[PDB]
Amino acid sequence: MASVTEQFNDIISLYSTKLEHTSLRQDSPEYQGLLLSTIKKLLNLKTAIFDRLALTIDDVSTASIKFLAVDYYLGLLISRRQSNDSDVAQRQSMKLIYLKKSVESFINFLTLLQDYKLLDPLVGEKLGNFKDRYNPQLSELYAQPKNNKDLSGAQLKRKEKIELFQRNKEISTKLHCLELELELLRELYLMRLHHFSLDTINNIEQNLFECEMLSNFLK
Amino acid sequence: ASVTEQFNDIISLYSTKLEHLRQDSPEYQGLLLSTIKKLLNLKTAIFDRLALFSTNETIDDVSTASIKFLAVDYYLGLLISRRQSNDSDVAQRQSMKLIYLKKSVESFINFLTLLQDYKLLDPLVGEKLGKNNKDLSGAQLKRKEKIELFQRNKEISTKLHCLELELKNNDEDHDHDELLRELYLMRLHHFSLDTINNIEQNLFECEMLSNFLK
Numbered sequence: 083m084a085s086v087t088e089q090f091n092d093i094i095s096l097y098s099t100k101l102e103h104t105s106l107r108q109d110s111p112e113y114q115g116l117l118l119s120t121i122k123k124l125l126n127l128k129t130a131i132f133d134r135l136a137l138t139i140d141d142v143s144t145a146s147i148k149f150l151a152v153d154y155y156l157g158l159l160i161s162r163r164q165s166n167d168s169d170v171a172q173r174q175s176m177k178l179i180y181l182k183k184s185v186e187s188f189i190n191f192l193t194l195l196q197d198y199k200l201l202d203p204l205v206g207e208k209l210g211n212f213k214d215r216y217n218p219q220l221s222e223l224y225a226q227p228k229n230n231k232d233l234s235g236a237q238l239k240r241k242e243k244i245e246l247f248q249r250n251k252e253i254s255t256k257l258h259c260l261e262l263e264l265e266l267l268r269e270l271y272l273m274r275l276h277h278f279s280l281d282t283i284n285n286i287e288q289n290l291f292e293c294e295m296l297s298n299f300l301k
Numbered sequence: 302a303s304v305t306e307q308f309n310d311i312i313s314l315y316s317t318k319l320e321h322l323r324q325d326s327p328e329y330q331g332l333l334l335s336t337i338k339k340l341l342n343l344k345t346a347i348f349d350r351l352a353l354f355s356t357n358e359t360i361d362d363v364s365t366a367s368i369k370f371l372a373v374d375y376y377l378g379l380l381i382s383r384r385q386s387n388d389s390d391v392a393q394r395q396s397m398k399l400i401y402l403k404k405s406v407e408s409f410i411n412f413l414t415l416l417q418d419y420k421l422l423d424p425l426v427g428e429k430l431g432k433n434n435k436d437l438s439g440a441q442l443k444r445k446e447k448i449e450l451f452q453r454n455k456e457i458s459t460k461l462h463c464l465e466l467e468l469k470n471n472d473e474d475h476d477h478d479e480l481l482r483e484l485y486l487m488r489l490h491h492f493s494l495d496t497i498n499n500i501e502q503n504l505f506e507c508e509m510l511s512n513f514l515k
């Protein structure tokens with residue numbers, strides 16, 4: 083519906099202008115209220131595009147390429163949800179559900195790019211390391227030091243992080259020069275997905291760590 | 302019975318049953334509490350009664366067999382770290398945990414101060430001694446992967462390892478008292494790193510808990 087592109091564009095704008103960063107309290111009903119309706123809209127859009135219109139990357143028309151990011155944006159929005167339930171257990175437990183759902187969306191997104199043979203092999207190696215795609219482990223994303231003496235383990239982790247970081251910076255700069263230069267459109271859209279897939283690894287790490295940390299306090 | 306025998310038993314209890322199965326259990330928390338109580342009473346005896354470290358002005362005035370007592374505050378930090386409420390109410394548990402972590406930090410800092418008093422505190426440790434849940438978790442993550450910590454732990458562990466072997470390796474039947482003492486003091490150096498570590502972990506957890514309220 084309406085068009086799908088305009089709808090997507092409005093969603094992304096709400097995200098960038100009001101939901102990515104806020105000056106309001108994140109537990110505020112004004113913030114969560116807009117966040118929730120945004121998500122509801124994006125979920126409706128996914129159904130419209132993927133289910134009802136039912137849309138190789140050669141096969142995708144230029145303006146449709148944007149939509150491969152719907153799960154990315156669901157990832158980003160969902161990780162930001164918070165409950166205001168008076169019940170403290172319920173509100174904390176809900177947070178874990180949000181982080182779980184955010185990560186699932188993020189994984190949907192990578193899996194989709196992989197299905198289109200678009201996935202940076204750096205990102206794909208990480209995606210592949212999940213023994214259970216639906217139960218992904220922070221221990222599968224990077225090598226982790228065995229203990230607090232494991233210098234090699236820690237140096238290996240730093241090596242893998244630095245490689246993520248450099249690659250992310252590289253694609254960010256390529257995306258940046260493309261946006262500013264704005265035939266190029268198609269390249270921009272593809273580069274944008276590229277930057278998203280790298281960003282995703284950071285979000286998946288942060289959410290898995292954050293989830294594990296907040297979970298211990300409920301145990 | 303004596304101050305020194307009470308200490309070895311407290312430490313042995315910790316190492317065997319309290320350091321690492323079932324932590325929410327009344328049985329574990331019961332044993333943790335009695336051990337903390339014993340250790341606080343031993344603290345009163347050595348620190349206040351005997352005044353061991355207020356009356357021996359220099360580290361060399363402390364006997365080798367009494368160097369071990371410097372770690373009292375260290376073990377109190379550790380024990381207190383592991384205290385948990387088993388109340389059905391989540392908010393009570395979490396607030397009770399906040400309190401414990403705050404009290405474990407106090408002991409740990411007490412331990413470093415005491416090492417500082419004896420001019421034994423490592424210069425790096427010394428300068429360490431003297432935001433929502435997403436940002437805290439983010440910050441923790443990056444701190445936890447800093448190299449300096451692992452490099453330093455590796456070093457001290459190998460120094461420790463070699464000191465123990467130099468102590469044991471003794472076909473000549475020499476007096477290895479100077480080495481024994483070096484071992485003990487190095488072990489406190491180790492503890493001091495683990496303390497800075499634990500203090501950060503606790504402060505992070507304590508800040509996370511505090512967020513849940515504001």
Ligand SMILES: [Zn+2]
Pocket residue numbers: 258259262
């Ligand atoms: Zn440029």
Ligand SMILES: [Zn+2]
Pocket residue numbers: 178181182289290293294
């Ligand atoms: Zn989770």
Ligand SMILES: [Zn+2]
Pocket residue numbers: 463
């Ligand atoms: Zn050696």
Ligand SMILES: [Zn+2]
Pocket residue numbers: 504507508511
């Ligand atoms: Zn605190």
